[PDB]
């Protein structure tokens, strides 16, 4: 009965400045890897002793991942800014929570893929890992475009894939 | 391993 989580959030900056991005990783309700944007040296850091052994290539790779996520989140907050017809004189936030639950057998029990905006539930992946649950007007658009682009199977490719193996890989180091 | 967002919306 183990789990794994990733909380990646982005917040728009007042006036005229680049938004703040963060990425916190959890393994069995324990923070293990962390990232921030406005830090002096924006990189990924291990939050537990067990991680430090990992090679530098791992760190540079996941750092590039983080940068790509910065750009991604930027484009998406501009997008959602356009969706809800909002002016640029305000501050908003976007959250992405993606994780996995693994049973006693070691095999994946429940995959998690949730996107929220401004403290409200935006779009969420379902237990079947194929469909989408959306609430309001702007979310149905995302659901359509992702039904045509086949997003559920990509996020399923990650969830059933790397998430599990890396989770076990971390559990072995504890 | 962190995931890549990949898809805009």
């Amino acid at each position: 009965p183990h789990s794994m989580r990733y909380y990646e959030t982005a917040t728009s900056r007042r006036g005229l400045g680049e938004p703040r991005y963060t990425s916190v990783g959890y393994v069995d309700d324990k923070e293990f890897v962390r990232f921030d944007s406005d830090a002096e040296n924006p990189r990924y850091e291990p939050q537990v002793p067990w991680m430090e052994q990992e090679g530098p290539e791992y760190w540079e790779r996941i750092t590039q991942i983080a940068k790509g996520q910065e750009q991604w989140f930027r484009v998406n907050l501009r997008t959602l800014l356009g969706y809800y017809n909002q002016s640029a004189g305000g501050t908003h936030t976007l959250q992405w929570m993606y994780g996995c639950d693994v049973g006693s057998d070691g095999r994946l029990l429940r995959g998690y893929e949730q996107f929220a905006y401004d403290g409200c539930d935006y779009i969420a992946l379902n237990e079947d890992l194929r469909t989408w649950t959306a609430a309001d007007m702007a979310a149905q658009i995302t659901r359509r475009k992702w039904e045509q682009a086949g997003a559920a199977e990509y996020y399923r490719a990650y969830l059933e894939g790397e998430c599990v193996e890396w989770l076990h890989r971390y559990l072995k180091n504890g | 391993q962190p995931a890549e967002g990949g898809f805009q919306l």
Partner: T-cell receptor
Framework: SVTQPDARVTVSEGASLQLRCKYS??????LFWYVQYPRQGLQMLLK??????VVQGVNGFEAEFSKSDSSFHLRKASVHWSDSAVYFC????????????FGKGAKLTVSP | AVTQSPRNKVTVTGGNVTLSCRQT?????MYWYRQDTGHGLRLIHY???????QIGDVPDGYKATRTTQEDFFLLLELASPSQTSLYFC??????????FGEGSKLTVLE
Amino acid sequence: SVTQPDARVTVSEGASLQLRCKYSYSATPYLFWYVQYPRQGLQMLLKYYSGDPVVQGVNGFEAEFSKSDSSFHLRKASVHWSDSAVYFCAVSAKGTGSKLSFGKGAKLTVSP
Amino acid sequence: AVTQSPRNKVTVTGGNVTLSCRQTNSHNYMYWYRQDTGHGLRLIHYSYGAGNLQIGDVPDGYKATRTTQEDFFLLLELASPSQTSLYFCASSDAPGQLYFGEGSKLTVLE
């Protein structure tokens, strides 16, 4: 890297078609097929991330993925003269999902 | 759609070339490829947003520049006949799902 057996293929019009494609990644990558008609850019024919190994594509194109043989074979029930193009198989490693890698490409000539 | 410029170009060795790539739909990922005989096509450069770059499979000889989200440039400072090729630029709002340009045939002469 992606390996496509033949660069030149010739088939009579109104015949079955299978274009083969094998990759070299142990960890199953994202799989893709693309088409290049003469004097044109490349168009995505079909894609595969996870789930159903049989992927349906536009214009009657299909692709079967074999985890066993690490295969991703393109298939079409019947070919026409309009289907004369160069077909590419593309992959992207896990983590480097937006980084594609194309095969040599198979020039498909369909004798009408 | 995705528009690249110019469609065709002929230059001499040591000449300066610059290929332009503009998209009308604000996709983020942008690509620069070249298609050769017996090599299919190979990734020269690519970018995951404005003001950023990333090295492909064959970066030697080619420098790139991403000024905006919709403008990607592939620069060629020192021209060589080994760089005589057909260059395609691409865009993507999805990992692996690319939108290719019209094409840019270039020939370099000694």
